[PDB]
Amino acid sequence: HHWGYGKHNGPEHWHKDFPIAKGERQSPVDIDTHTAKYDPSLKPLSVSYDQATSLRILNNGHAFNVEFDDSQDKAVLKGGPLDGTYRLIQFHFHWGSLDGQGSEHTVDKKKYAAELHLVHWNTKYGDFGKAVQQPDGLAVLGIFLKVGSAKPGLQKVVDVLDSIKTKGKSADFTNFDPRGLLPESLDYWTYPGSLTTPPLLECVTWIVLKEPISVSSEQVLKFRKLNFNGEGEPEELMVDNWRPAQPLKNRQIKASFK
């Protein structure tokens, strides 16, 4: 009886196996733009993805994951709220069954069609597994998707999804440049939170970009043809793989922009 997004194993059940689900710094959260405060102590954000080496794309039964070679300092996130250097390990999306839902973070309670998460670990901790035992182990760059014009930098991902339809399937996915998934502006909000999936670990410095990227209805429709189930099992479309907003508790959301 594994965790998932259904009625009997979804977000309202996760706390039974992962009691940190009811913790003091869970994600995602609603970003109340009027309560968010500009923070002059934030340094410029540095997203340095020129040398990123992608390896593989994987359907893990919850999302599709594009995985990178993180054995050297290549694709790194620095600056902003971060102390030190965080290495890109993978990215994935959360999306809806309909265009009106799919994001995990919300903005004044607005839900976007999807949300991209670029996951990075703090290189002072040596490896990802050690980083996830630290309160500043991870940084996730979150980017909202709205439906409108196509995102040409996404199409290579969309086009390989047919080959990883079911849980456990993977495909080679080299030479993919995640710079093509970024909006023009790096204006962002930041707060301390958690992974939004089990194990829900409270390691994450969240950096959520204000500017969404636009993707086409056809692009997102292809996300929604993936399957949660494995090959030869009854078809359950991979849709609505998002956790809703959690209590803000004793936190403040800071803005990089005035």
Ligand X SMILES: [N]S(=O)(=O)[N][C]C1234B567B89%10B5%11%12B85%13B98%14B%1061B821B326B%115(B%12724)C%13%1416
User: Is residue 26 a contact residue for ligand X (CB under 6 A)?
Assistant: no
With CB under 6 A as the contact rule, the residue among 140, 147, 154, 213 that binds ligand X is: 140
User: Taking contact as CB under 6 A, which single stretch among the options 12-20, 44-52, 192-200, 209-217 is the one that binds ligand X?
Assistant: 192-200
**CB of residue 152 to ligand X, shortest distance in Å:** 25
Alpha carbon distance 59, 61 (integer Å): 6
Q: Closest-CB residue for ligand X?
A: 195
Residue type, 195: L
Q: Cβ atoms within 10 A of the Cβ of 71, count?
A: 9
**CB of residue 12 to ligand X, shortest distance in Å:** 17
Which of 140, 168, 218 is CA-nearest to residue 64?
A: 168
User: Is residue 195 a contact residue for ligand X (CB under 6 A)?
Assistant: yes
Q: Which long-range contacts (CB under 8 A, 24 or more apart) does 17-23 make?
A: 17/198, 18/198, 18/199, 18/200, 20/194, 20/199, 20/200, 20/201, 20/202, 21/200, 23/194, 23/200, 23/202
User: Is residue 196 a contact residue for ligand X (CB under 6 A)?
Assistant: yes
State yes or no: 196 annotated in a binding site. yes
With CB under 5 A as the contact rule, the residue among 25, 117, 169, 222 that binds Zn ion is: 117
User: Is residue 62 a contact residue for Zn ion (CB under 5 A)?
Assistant: no
**Assigned token pair, 63:** 């999302």
8 is an active site residue: no
State yes or no: 35 annotated in a binding site. no
User: Taking contact as CB under 5 A, which single stretch among the options 29-37, 67-75, 111-119, 173-181 is the one that binds Zn ion?
Assistant: 111-119
- Annotated catalytic residue, options 8, 15, 34, 62: 62
Is the CB of 50 or the CB of 131 nearer to Zn ion?
131
Is the CB of 169 or the CB of 243 nearer to Zn ion?
243
State the binding site for Zn(2+): 92, 94, 117
Q: Which residues are catalytic?
A: 62
